[PDB]
């Protein structure tokens, strides 16, 4: 058992809930948020931009630290770092962007990061800005994640449409 609620049950594994995940995460304070990372951890906007800001900047300034010894993430990489305020650990992911011209195949790599953790708070991975389709997304994301992975999805016209397509 555990405390995240509202949600919907796709699979075994896969749940989704129409919700924003920096609200939920400031809620459940889960052992893992993901979010949308890039290469560079710049947290500038989309749910990257809304966590650093619920953070006061925090992830931001260590994830320059990070860049500064390690060097840029590969797109489908990740790396753990501090939740900060939201959770104990946020998992930064890197899915393709498409408005950079990255293949989608790097998709399923990207998910696969999330096989490392027993139980995530995480978005549509490639959704959003960067230019996905999210319904392609949630198809990768429950063809590809083992764990146990709760969905938030900002905007309820597209989480009743990936409800109503879904297969
Ligand atoms: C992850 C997706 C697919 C969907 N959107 C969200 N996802 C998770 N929580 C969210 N809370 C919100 C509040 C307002 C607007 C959007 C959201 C939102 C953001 C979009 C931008 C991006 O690329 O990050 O991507």
């Given at each position: 058992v555990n405390s995240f609620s509202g949600y919907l049950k796709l699979t075994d594994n896969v749940y989704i809930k129409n919700a924003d995940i920096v609200e939920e995460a400031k809620k459940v304070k889960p052992t893992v948020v993901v979010n949308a990372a890039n290469v560079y951890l710049?947290?500038?906007?989309?749910v990257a931009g809304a966590l650093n800001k619920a953070t006061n900047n925090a992830m931001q300034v260590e994830s320059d630290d990070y860049i500064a010894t390690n060097g840029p993430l590969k797109v489908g990489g990740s790396c753990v770092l501090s939740g900060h305020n939201?959770?104990?650990?946020?998992?930064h992911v890197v899915g393709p962007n498409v408005n950079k011209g990255?293949?989608?195949?790097?998709l399923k790599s990207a998910y696969?990061?999330?096989?490392?953790?027993?139980v995530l708070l995480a978005p549509?991975?490639?959704a959003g800005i960067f230019g996905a389709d999210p319904i392609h997304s949630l198809r990768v994301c429950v063809d590809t994640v083992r764990t146990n992975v709760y969905l938030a999805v900002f905007d309820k016209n597209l989480y009743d449409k990936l409800v109503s397509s879904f297969l």
């Open positions: 710049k947290h500038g906007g989309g939201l959770a104990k650990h946020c998992l990255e293949d989608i195949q790097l696969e990061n999330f096989n490392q953790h027993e549509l991975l490639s």
